[PDB]
Ligand binder design. Structure first.
Ligand SMILES: [Zn+2]
Ligand SMILES: [Zn+2]
Ligand SMILES: [Zn+2]
Ligand SMILES: [Zn+2]
Ligand SMILES: [Zn+2]
Ligand SMILES: [Zn+2]
Ligand SMILES: [Zn+2]
Ligand SMILES: [Zn+2]
Ligand SMILES: [Zn+2]
Length: 277
DNA sequence: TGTGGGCGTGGCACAGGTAAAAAGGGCA
DNA sequence: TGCCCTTTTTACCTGTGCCACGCCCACA
C-alpha cells in the first residue's frame, strides 16, 4: 500500500501496487545482460555496463550508471540530490552545473560573449558557437549509411534509423502496442488514463500531447500559413492547401472502386467505402 | 425524413529541428 | 583527476499524414 517510485499514484494494496508497476516496464527496453538492470536508452545502458567491464569506474548506486573519475560521478549525482552548488555572484541564482552558470552569466555585464554573426544568439564559449553555426552552414556530418541524409550528431542519425528499421521498442503493457519513443508510449499511457495535462487557456479542452494542444490553439490565434496564390484562402495545414488546390483544378485523386465515385480527400473514400462494409 | 458528401478540425504515432542537460576530456 | 570548456545525448519544439469525427447543406 505505497506510492509508486515512478508515478506516485497511490496504489494501496501491496499486490495492487506490484500489479501497478507491471505497467511501467515497457518504458525501459534496454536490459543489462549481467544484472538485468533496465534503462530507457541504449546509451544509458552503456554507462551502466561499464561496471561489468572496467575495473577503474565509479558507479552511482542510485541509478547504476558509472563514470571514469569521481568528480564525474559527484556531478551526476546532483540529478538525484537536487543540489545546486554553482551560484551567480551577481544575483545569487544557483545552478546544478558550472555549464549552466556560465550561460547565465551572459545576462550580466562583463562576461565574455561569443556572438553569432548571422542571428542574435550569443554563447558562453567557442565550442557552443561553432555548434550553432552549423545550422547556418547546413552541415550535417553523420550520414545515414542507408538514407544518405545527414544529421548533426550520431545520436540523431541513430534516432532517425527508426525509418530504416520500423522497430518499436517501447511497449504498453495494457494494450500491447509498441512505440518508437518513450515519449509517445508515455502519451499513449496518458490516453488510457485520460490524463490530459495540457489544457487550453481559451477553450478549456485538454490534451495528452504537447503537439495536439498547439495545433488546436491555431484557431483562436488565427495562425494560418499556406495561403492560396489563386483565391487567397488561408489554411492551417500544408495538407489543407493540397486539398483545396485540387478543388480549383477539379482534381479528384481518390475515387471508389465500387462507387466509381470520386472525392478530393481520402477521409471520405474511407467514410463511403464503409457502405459496402 | 433521409443520405451523404464537403469540410474544418480532433486523435494519433511520427520525423527532424534547435535548446538544453549531461557526460567527456585537455591541461597541469 | 578536478577545473572548466568540449562533445555527446536528451528534452523541448514544430510541423506532418492518415484516419476519424460531427456539423452543414444540396438534394434523393
Ligand atoms: Zn507508477
Ligand atoms: Zn548490469
Ligand atoms: Zn545516478
Ligand atoms: Zn546564428
Ligand atoms: Zn536515412
Ligand atoms: Zn495501451
Ligand atoms: Zn482552444
Ligand atoms: Zn484557392
Ligand atoms: Zn463504393
Amino acid at each position: 500500500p505505497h506510492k509508486c517510485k515512478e508515478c506516485g499514484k497511490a496504489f494501496h494494496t501491496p499486490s495492487q501496487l506490484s500489479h501497478h508497476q507491471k505497467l511501467h516496464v515497457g518504458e525501459k527496453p534496454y536490459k543489462c545482460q549481467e544484472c538485468g538492470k533496465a534503462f530507457p536508452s541504449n546509451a544509458q545502458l552503456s554507462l551502466h555496463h561499464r561496471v561489468h567491464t572496467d575495473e577503474k569506474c565509479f558507479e552511482c548506486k542510485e541509478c547504476g550508471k558509472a563514470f571514469m573519475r569521481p568528480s564525474h560521478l559527484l556531478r551526476h549525482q546532483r540529478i538525484h540530490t537536487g543540489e545546486k552548488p554553482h551560484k551567480c555572484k551577481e544575483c545569487g541564482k544557483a545552478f546544478r552545473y558550472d555549464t549552466q552558470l556560465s550561460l547565465h552569466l551572459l545576462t550580466h555585464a562583463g562576461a565574455r560573449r561569443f556572438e553569432c554573426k548571422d542571428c542574435d544568439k550569443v554563447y558562453s564559449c567557442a565550442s557552443q558557437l561553432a555548434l550553432h553555426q552549423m545550422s547556418h552552414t547546413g552541415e550535417k556530418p553523420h550520414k545515414c549509411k542507408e538514407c544518405g541524409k545527414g544529421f548533426i550528431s550520431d545520436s540523431h542519425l541513430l534516432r532517425h534509423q527508426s525509418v530504416h528499421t520500423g522497430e518499436t521498442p517501447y511497449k504498453c503493457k495494457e494494450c500491447g502496442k509498441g512505440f518508437r519513443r518513450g515519449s509517445e508510449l508515455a502519451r499513449h499511457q496518458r490516453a488510457h488514463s485520460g490524463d490530459k495535462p495540457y489544457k487550453c487557456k481559451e477553450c478549456g479542452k485538454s490534451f495528452t500531447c504537447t503537439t495536439e494542444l498547439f495545433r488546436h490553439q491555431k484557431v483562436h490565434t488565427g495562425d494560418r500559413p499556406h495561403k492560396c496564390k489563386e483565391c487567397g484562402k488561408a489554411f492551417i495545414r500544408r495538407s489543407e492547401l493540397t486539398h483545396h488546390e485540387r478543388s480549383h483544378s477539379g482534381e479528384k485523386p481518390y475515387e471508389c472502386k465500387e462507387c466509381g465515385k470520386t472525392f478530393g480527400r481520402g477521409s471520405e473514400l474511407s467514410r463511403h467505402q464503409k457502405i459496402h462494409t
